[PDB]
Amino acid sequence: TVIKNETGTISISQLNKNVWVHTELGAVPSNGLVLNTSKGLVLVDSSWDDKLTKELIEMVEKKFQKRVTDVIITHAHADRIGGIKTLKERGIKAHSTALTAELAKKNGYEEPLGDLQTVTNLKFGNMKVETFYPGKGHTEDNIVVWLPQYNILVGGCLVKSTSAKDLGNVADAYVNEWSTSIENVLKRYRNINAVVPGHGEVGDKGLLLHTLDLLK
Amino acid sequence: TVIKNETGTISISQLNKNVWVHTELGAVPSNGLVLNTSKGLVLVDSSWDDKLTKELIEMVEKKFQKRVTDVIITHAHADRIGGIKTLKERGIKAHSTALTAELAKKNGYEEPLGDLQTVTNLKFGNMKVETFYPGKGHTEDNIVVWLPQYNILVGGCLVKSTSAKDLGNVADAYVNEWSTSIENVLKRYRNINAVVPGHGEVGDKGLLLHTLDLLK
Ligand SMILES: [Zn+2]
Ligand SMILES: [Zn+2]
Ligand SMILES: [Zn+2]
Ligand SMILES: [Zn+2]
């Protein structure tokens, strides 16, 4: 199932009962995640800007008939933190590491909570969520999100899609450290069902291996 | 002095007395050089395809009322070797390293001469040209061109432009070695003035430092 706005700029794609992917065209798509929990809707990343983030939120709240309560920001770039203003106005908890928090205020954005640690485990009702900082890669602050109950990994901009021949913006990247960081992810999670790249189609463990090839 | 065509897809900007930069959109702009010599016109790289390449040739030949005698191909990608069939049927000598030639074949393009060695000095009438293979970077075969009379460096796709934050296609690239290869160019030419990127505005030695920054 894939719900979209009329222009198709925003879509939510179902992976399983309570796990959906959210994609918004900024014409450049960006992937995030939506989790339907007993404590409310939990998102992995916002969107390019406030309009899209506000529309996205109204979309999911309408679908699941519940309020978005928490959002996990994987890094301090527009496609991830572009809708911080909205979150705060709406009273939504914008989770992030302390580094992402400081880089956000540096990049000229409103400051997230800065509550997440290198390894943070959060249980939203029955939905178990793990955030993991693997080291520098796409950015110095990038983190990944893991769903141990489903063995699903949200790679963010640290992971490229299967057809990707590009690495994207590397001005703020640590290209040489990137490989080691992905190796850390491969080391931490031995059985992977699906991997969600920052942009593109959902894949599997291959997306990590493919991203390493691009880095060689 | 900048001259284009009725459609705007091909323009030629004068760098100096005998050196011009040719640029075509394919919708990304691609740069190459047009050298006006006492014995004909000499280009550094062709264009995205045979249609654009032929039109480019017809434009400069009409303008300088001379014939394009030689063309230097910097690597085996469409923006560089696209009009190879056009060159060969017009009797234009298509210079390239042996590696670029074999990769051209592998990529499905007609084969260039494969005559260029690591350091090849060519003189067309008055115009002096030096081709140099600095090692693997953007591709396995990329070379740079040096005009010793003007101290102008055509970095090709080995060098990113000032506003570029992306390295482009890295599927065929050797990211780790790309840094050592730019260092070889920096070490080879001690007094560089202008440097032409594969795509983007002409700059100076700072473009090489910028690209090394992106590679970090
Ligand atoms: Zn980013
Ligand atoms: Zn991204
Ligand atoms: Zn290329
Ligand atoms: Zn190029």
Side-chain angles (χ1 to χ4, degrees):
Chain A
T1 299
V2 191
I3 295 150
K4 299 192 184 195
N5 51 353
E6 294 178 71
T7 55
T9 60
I10 301 177
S11 68
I12 307 155
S13 311
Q14 184 175 43
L15 292 189
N16 50 74
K17 193 187 181 181
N18 301 304
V19 178
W20 294 59
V21 178
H22 74 79
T23 308
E24 303 78 56
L25 287 180
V28 191
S30 178
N31 298 331
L33 211 78
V34 190
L35 303 168
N36 186 17
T37 87
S38 59
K39 308 308 170 197
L41 293 177
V42 178
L43 310 182
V44 173
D45 287 320
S46 66
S47 198
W48 303 95
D49 57 29
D50 289 298
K51 288 203 178 75
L52 296 163
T53 294
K54 182 172 178 172
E55 183 170 3
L56 165 74
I57 292 174
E58 291 170 328
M59 276 188 52
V60 297
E61 294 186 343
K62 184 175 175 294
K63 164 56 181 171
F64 306 99
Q65 287 292 295
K66 62 179 62 170
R67 238 70 182 164
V68 164
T69 58
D70 304 84
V71 173
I72 298 176
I73 308 298
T74 64
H75 81 269
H77 278 172
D79 60 325
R80 308 292 134 181
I81 202 181
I84 182 63
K85 236 174 184 175
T86 299
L87 301 180
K88 293 183 173 176
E89 280 176 12
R90 304 186 65 91
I92 296 163
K93 307 283 162 49
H95 307 271
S96 79
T97 61
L99 178 54
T100 296
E102 59 180 89
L103 293 177
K105 187 62 176 71
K106 180 178 181 179
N107 285 2
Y109 288 104
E110 281 185 25
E111 183 174 73
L113 298 184
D115 61 294
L116 304 175
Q117 301 306 308
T118 288
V119 178
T120 301
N121 292 267
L122 295 156
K123 188 194 177 196
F124 298 95
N126 189 68
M127 187 64 75
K128 289 178 180 170
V129 177
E130 172 175 287
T131 66
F132 175 57
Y133 173 62
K136 307 187 183 83
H138 173 63
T139 50
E140 89 178 296
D141 66 315
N142 60 205
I143 58 161
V144 298
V145 177
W146 174 252
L147 304 185
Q149 296 170 305
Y150 306 85
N151 283 188
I152 293 173
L153 177 72
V154 184
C157 304
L158 183 82
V159 186
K160 302 300 138 184
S161 62
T162 194
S163 303
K165 292 184 176 181
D166 206 297
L167 283 174
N169 185 302
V170 292
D172 304 306
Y174 293 79
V175 182
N176 188 57
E177 297 190 44
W178 200 328
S179 282
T180 292
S181 302
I182 289 174
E183 291 295 335
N184 283 332
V185 177
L186 286 164
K187 277 177 183 174
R188 188 177 182 80
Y189 314 116
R190 292 152 187 174
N191 284 271
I192 299 168
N193 282 2
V195 177
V196 181
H199 309 285
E201 306 298 290
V202 171
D204 59 23
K205 193 186 176 203
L207 297 197
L208 293 171
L209 309 182
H210 172 56
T211 302
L212 291 171
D213 292 325
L214 292 186
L215 288 162
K216 292 181 184 179
Chain B
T1 303
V2 188
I3 94 94
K4 309 180 189 297
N5 49 20
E6 321 73 66
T7 314
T9 50
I10 299 178
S11 77
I12 295 165
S13 317
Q14 186 166 31
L15 258 192
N16 65 65
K17 36 181 297 305
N18 289 331
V19 185
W20 299 66
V21 168
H22 71 77
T23 304
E24 307 77 48
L25 299 165
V28 168
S30 184
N31 301 324
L33 292 192
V34 177
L35 306 178
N36 186 29
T37 87
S38 63
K39 300 182 180 178
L41 298 174
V42 177
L43 273 46
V44 172
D45 284 324
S46 71
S47 204
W48 303 90
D49 56 28
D50 285 303
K51 180 185 182 179
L52 281 174
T53 297
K54 185 182 181 178
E55 180 176 8
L56 168 59
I57 294 165
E58 293 284 340
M59 181 182 293
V60 300
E61 288 186 357
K62 168 167 183 171
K63 173 169 179 49
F64 308 99
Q65 295 283 301
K66 310 181 176 184
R67 100 164 159 98
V68 172
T69 60
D70 302 72
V71 174
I72 296 170
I73 300 300
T74 59
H75 69 277
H77 280 165
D79 64 319
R80 306 293 133 192
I81 203 172
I84 180 68
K85 177 172 186 167
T86 295
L87 302 185
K88 308 187 71 175
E89 75 190 19
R90 291 181 78 106
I92 301 170
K93 292 182 168 184
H95 308 276
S96 80
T97 51
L99 180 60
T100 295
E102 73 157 71
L103 298 188
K105 178 176 171 176
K106 182 189 193 301
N107 292 11
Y109 296 99
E110 288 192 4
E111 270 189 70
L113 294 173
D115 56 321
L116 305 178
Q117 307 303 292
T118 295
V119 174
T120 305
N121 296 106
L122 304 156
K123 192 179 179 182
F124 311 94
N126 54 288
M127 195 62 70
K128 290 178 183 170
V129 176
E130 184 192 281
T131 68
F132 174 53
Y133 175 63
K136 307 172 186 176
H138 167 61
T139 51
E140 182 191 7
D141 62 314
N142 55 205
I143 58 166
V144 296
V145 185
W146 174 247
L147 308 186
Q149 300 164 311
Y150 307 94
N151 280 200
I152 293 180
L153 178 73
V154 183
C157 302
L158 187 77
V159 180
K160 310 311 300 189
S161 58
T162 205
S163 77
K165 312 294 155 49
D166 200 315
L167 294 172
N169 175 351
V170 296
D172 306 313
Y174 294 75
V175 180
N176 188 66
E177 278 301 310
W178 195 333
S179 285
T180 300
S181 300
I182 288 171
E183 289 295 348
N184 295 158
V185 176
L186 286 172
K187 288 170 185 170
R188 183 168 182 75
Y189 313 106
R190 295 297 169 90
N191 266 190
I192 306 167
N193 282 359
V195 342
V196 185
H199 308 270
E201 306 290 74
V202 187
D204 68 358
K205 180 182 162 185
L207 291 180
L208 295 159
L209 303 180
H210 167 62
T211 308
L212 281 169
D213 185 26
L214 295 184
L215 288 160
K216 291 192 172 185

